[PDB]
Amino acid sequence: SIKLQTNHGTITLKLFADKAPETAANFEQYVKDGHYDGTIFHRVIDGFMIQGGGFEPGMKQKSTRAPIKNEANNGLSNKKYTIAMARTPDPHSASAQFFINVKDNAFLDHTAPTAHGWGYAVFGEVVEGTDVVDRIKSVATGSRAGHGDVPVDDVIIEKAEIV
Amino acid sequence: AFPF
16 A cells, blocks of 8 residues: 655555554654655665655755654564564654564564664565565665665665555 | 664
């Protein structure tokens, strides 16, 4: 139901509104408010995941709304192609940034309601365009500012829309 | 910066 038109192709996402209600609603809102238009996948790590939704070209961090509670304990594993919320070490700090697993990453799953075990909340999955994710994951990257794994050439989310 |  969500379409991410990027300069590498279009990624279509299906959200799990019931299994991760607060997270799905938070994401959909950002899309609706056009917050993701013009953002990049600033952290691309082959064999791990691709993260975006927080920076504009030149690593310019956008403002966000208040954090959301962590819904990682919903029984959903960080399987290949699932989308989940990136965050601060603080479990309940997720805001606008998300990542798409490019590999089964069980280690990211909730194990306990503890600082280190809270895990990362899966709230959807790439329904169409997994090939787009497969290509993005292997693009050239390098360090910039206090960021590593930044794509040499910007991977841009031109527009995100609810369909 | 997470997940690490």
